[PDB]
Amino acid sequence: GRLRVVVLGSTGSIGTQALQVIADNPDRFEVVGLAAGGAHLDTLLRQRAQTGVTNIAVADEHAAQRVGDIPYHGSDAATRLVEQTEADVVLNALVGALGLRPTLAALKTGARLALANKESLVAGGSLVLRAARPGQIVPVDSEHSALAQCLRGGTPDEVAKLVLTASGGPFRGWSAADLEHVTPEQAGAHPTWSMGPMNTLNSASLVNKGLEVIETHLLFGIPYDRIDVVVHPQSIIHSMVTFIDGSTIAQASPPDMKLPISLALGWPRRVSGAAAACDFHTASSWEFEPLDTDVFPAVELARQAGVAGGCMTAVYNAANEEAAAAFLAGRIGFPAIVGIIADVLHAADQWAVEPATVDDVLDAQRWARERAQRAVSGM
Template sequence: MTNPITIFEDTAPCSERPRPVRVAVLGCSGSIGTQTLDVARRHADKVQVTALSVNSSTDKLVAAAREFGCAHVAVADAAHRNDACLAELPCGCDAGFGAEAVSALAALPDVDIVVNALVGFAGIHAGYEALRADKVLAYANKESIVCGGDLLMPMAKPGRLIPVDSEHSAIFQCLVGERSREVHCIWLTCSGGPFYGKTRAELDVVTAADALAHPTWDMGAKITIDSASLMNKGLEVIEAKHLFQVPVDSVRVLVQRQSKIHSMVEFADGVVKAQLGGSDMRAPIQYALSYPERWEASVERVDWGSCAPITFGEADEETFGCLRLAKDAGRTGGTLPCAMNAANEVANLAFRQGSCGFTEIERVVSAVMDQTSVERVENLQQLLDVDARAREAARRVLTAEV
């Protein structure tokens, strides 16, 4: 049994963060990364951004490094090593190139917190290095926990792994000070995405542009497509299983269209605690940076007396089969979630590129899961091998369906 990251009665309280806290933002040009920099601007007396990474957006990297006076930067795509704009980096700022350079930022001595906003399974390397170096890991890279939770969670000390996903941040906050044995279930909320209520026939003809029109959240393209298919919620069920040490079937998915209740925890006595707020990722990002403190809000406050009524609904696992598949993978465990995630990443990209239909995502994932020989998770290299094999299998399925 791994240690839950929530603050139950049997865990030591987390000491207060240094002031200012020194932060590495990995993936600083993406949605989570740019909003993390917004929080840093709002709380410049409390946050010092010391390291930044991007995949290829070197112009944005240089602008942010100059604004925050960063000492370290990394570019994952080494083909951008000679971009002219890099000459404008701050004096004395060291620059690294390639995936290993990005991961190395997570272990720097002048970094206290690593915000892992990298997209997809590739982010597991940086998360692994951050935990190995005993940094606080504020992570939005759910795929690394989905694929490697069995590997990463034993490395995480209480209070050192803080979720940035709005739902898991909400659960984390609801559980502070509670007893793990008194949790009855977790209510994991979702908006339902842009296709809530649609039939399978209607989903067969939707486009990537339709799927990218999320009703309440502004996110990157990959996660927005995952939200439309409900795969994102399936990944979050597996994530919650690892983070909070509960069975998959104790995580109940609940549609909350207004995205005001970010998740809830129900206890043995029937009492339910919920965390509410606006649809703004800067709130959970700030909590991950400030924990165990609370800083002045970086987001617009909700006027609860005038907001629209809050409604609930059931998640349709038959129409949105990706949710069902992810839960099946979570129940089985081992290397199956890793294979499932890899297949989804390949199919998600194919849909965005127009080379497969929306419902084909589910078919590709199902086919790859059926082909996967499940093993116990042993090490990072094993997961990399499983990921590579599953991606190749997904490409073969896509090619066969053309």
């Protein structure tokens, strides 16, 4: 029947798309809570008005006064909302380290976690996994959503390889020399999704694919050496699974996040009309090419951090946040993005120990941000 959904990060692109899927399907879903940072308030006010949901969390205190009548405000508003709201699904679409505590709180309640927040897995690692039951986390990322669907093609013992697709970004087929004089607006050219400057940048530097590889390992328990990345410029195939008999099962759709959002909210039940399907009435082609790992080391670096274990993938993510920002702020070169991540990881051998608590993870990320900051300061 109808599922009660807490929407964390409601004003971002995933949050607003989720609310649209919810509004179109009132028999399947109802919103019971909203959390937002506070950066966008005209949006949050409209969502309050349209849904009638007054059970809202706003992190920013000044934003919280400006909107008025907000029950959860300040530091851990989102966590408190999740702790005190009865729900069937928590959609965690918060950005950054802010998402980890709401994730653990959400898992403690027994609800399904529709996970969009990368930090939860990439930084939380085993902490989050230990907190979750089998099937409790359902991925919202289009690649992981595609994998979950393709995995219906057999039992776990029959999986040979998971194959993630990457667009290649705007610099697909460029030499390392070419990348040396890449500018912020070159990087943020023709984006597949519409989720902001940082996100489009991570697609260009292939760090997004690196983070997804890490999450694939954690979500599906497949070793890093059985997780492939292929470049697929059309971004129509969203991932594939190759099975032990030689069969490959692929998921394909015109890019539209409403599809994986709807599936994550409603899992295992599909949502009629969520997105447009591939249309075969006009000729088209789906192209595949190997990733040039020499020019784009981000994915191999992700594998190195993943295999190292412990707090290393938290270090990889934290270092990218500082390094990628520094590039957008005209302060370092494009190649130096992954360059800095490597330098930080190479210095991070103390963080190869598994974290015991959330504070351990936050300390590692604190360390990595500072170390990356220091590295940026020398350029």
